Design a protein around this ligand. Structure first.
Ligand SMILES: [Zn+2]
Lengths: 64, 51, 365
């Protein structure tokens, strides 16, 4: 499972970094290029793929 | 360094077909991609294509 | 100021004096707008703005969500408080909407009936403003970081496009020829800008820390390469003669086109003699930028002293171009400011930032 992801907003490969703040149960995914940021709740079973998942889902939901 | 022919002999075969050695085939590969890369770096080539 | 009016009436001073002095005074009194608002439609940060060059009424805005909004800046209502309403919108439901962020939008000069928009979806689309349909599309092998049409060309209608490829593309809007390219850069071309003075002069700034001026008619590469030191650290041209100590992610010719303002990721802005690329050594202090893409900043027009409005973190830093003296920080944005566009008719400013807001700065009183 890759940790760096293509940004849904600027389509820059591996430009998204994921930070797991487990102490606060929050994952923050940020694109280095276009500076888009997204915050989602996470669990101890969560992974950066799950945070990027929640980001893609939030984008598609907001774009309806 | 290309080695000489004795390090990579071209052994002749029951007929006339001269089979080359693995090193010779590999030097063929290196040469073709070296020439091809040379013409790309000499010309305009995408940095990722040159890479 | 009553002195200014009296001198204008009595002919002591040319009306030019009052006009430019009052323009400068208005720019100095720039503040968060008391009675003005801009309609919010972008779901993401605004990466670019462009007020049309003729009549200065309509404004384009490209968002990080790929939509393009067309606003009317005129206060067609009778109140002193108004919102810049959105006339048109390439929204998510448009058949030709950009799939990724729109990074540059530009009105066609000489006519408001057409505009262009380049996106990280590797497309430069040319839109008919009336029907609001794509008149043309140019596809690129790599994402577009910036594009620019010449604000002066009555003869050519080339769009200079800077992508992550090391080549500057020149797309002819006359019969569609995107094959023309300029060689000489080595990394992504983060900014491109045509000279407002010379028809065929194009300045290109790339991540290789170099800024090159090209005569696109010419067959012999760039005209000038900008050098910080002008020759103090002189070396055979393979890696020396850098404009900045980082990525040069913004270009802006001054109003007259005799100088060039380059902003780079070394936290420095520099002013260059546009005729021989000599550094004028104007200081400007430290200009904070860390943008990984092109940075859009503009200069003032029709004032006694030229100003440059640079995005500076979540603020707009206003500098005097030829002295470098820091005028002020326009401080009203909540995230990093991506673009600022200057309305020269009324010395107004419109800034788009990552907080999904377009803020209008108007002179006070
Ligand atoms: Zn991004």
């Amino acid at each position: 499972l890759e940790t760096q992801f293509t940004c849904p907003f600027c389509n820059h490969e591996k430009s998204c970094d994921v930070k797991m703040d487990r102490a606060r149960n929050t994952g923050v995914i940020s694109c280095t290029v276009c500076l888009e940021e997204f915050q989602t709740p996470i669990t101890y079973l969560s992974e950066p793929v799950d945070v990027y998942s929640d980001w893609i889902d939030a984008c598609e939901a907001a774009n309806q | 360094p290309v080695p000489p022919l004795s390090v990579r002999p071209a052994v002749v075969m029951q007929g006339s077909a001269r089979n080359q050695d693995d090193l010779t085939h590999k030097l063929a590969d290196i040469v073709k991609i070296n020439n091809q890369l040379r013409r790309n770096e000499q010309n305009g080539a995408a940095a990722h294509v040159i890479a | 100021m009553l002195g200014f009016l009296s001198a204008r009436q009595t002919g002591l001073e040319d009306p030019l004096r009052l006009r430019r002095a009052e323009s400068t005074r208005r720019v100095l009194g720039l503040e968060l707008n008391k009675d003005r608002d801009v309609e919010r439609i972008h779901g993401g940060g605004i990466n670019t703005l462009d007020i049309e060059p003729v009549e200065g009424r309509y404004m384009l805005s490209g968002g990080s969500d790929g939509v393009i909004v067309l606003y009317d800046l005129e206060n067609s209502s009778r109140q002193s408080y108004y919102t810049c309403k959105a006339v048109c919108s390439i929204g998510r439901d448009h058949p030709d909407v950009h799939r990724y962020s729109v990074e540059t939008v530009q009105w066609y000069p000489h006519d408001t009936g057409m505009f262009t928009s380049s996106s990280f979806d590797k497309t430069l689309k040319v839109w008919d403003t009336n029907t609001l349909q794509t008149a043309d599309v140019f596809n690129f092998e790599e994402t577009v970081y910036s594009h620019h049409m010449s604000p002066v060309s009555t003869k050519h209608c080339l769009v200079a496009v800077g992508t992550r490829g090391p080549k500057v593309q020149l797309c002819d809007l006359k019969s569609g020829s995107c094959s023309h390219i300029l060689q000489g850069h080595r990394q992504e071309i983060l900014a491109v800008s045509w000279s407002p003075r010379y028809d065929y002069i194009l300045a290109t700034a790339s991540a290789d820390s170099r800024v090159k001026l090209w005569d696109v008619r010419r067959a012999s590469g760039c005209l000038i390469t900008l050098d910080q030191h002008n020759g103090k650290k002189s070396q055979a041209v393979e890696s020396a003669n850098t404009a900045h100590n980082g990525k040069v992610n913004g270009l802006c010719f001054t109003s007259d086109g005799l100088h060039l303002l380059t902003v780079g990721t070394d936290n420095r802005m520099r002013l260059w003699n546009s005729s021989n690329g000599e550094n004028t050594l104007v200081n400007y202090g430290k200009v904070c930028n860390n943008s990984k893409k092109g940075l859009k900043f503009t200069v003032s027009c029709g004032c006694s002293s030229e100003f440059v409005f640079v995005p500076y973190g979540s603020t707009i830093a206003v500098y005097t171009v030829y002295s470098g003296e820091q005028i002020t920080m326009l401080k009203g944005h909540y995230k990093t400011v991506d673009c600022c566009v200057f309305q020269s008719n009324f010395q107004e400013l419109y800034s788009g930032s990552r907080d999904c807001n377009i803020l209008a700065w108007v002179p006070s009183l």
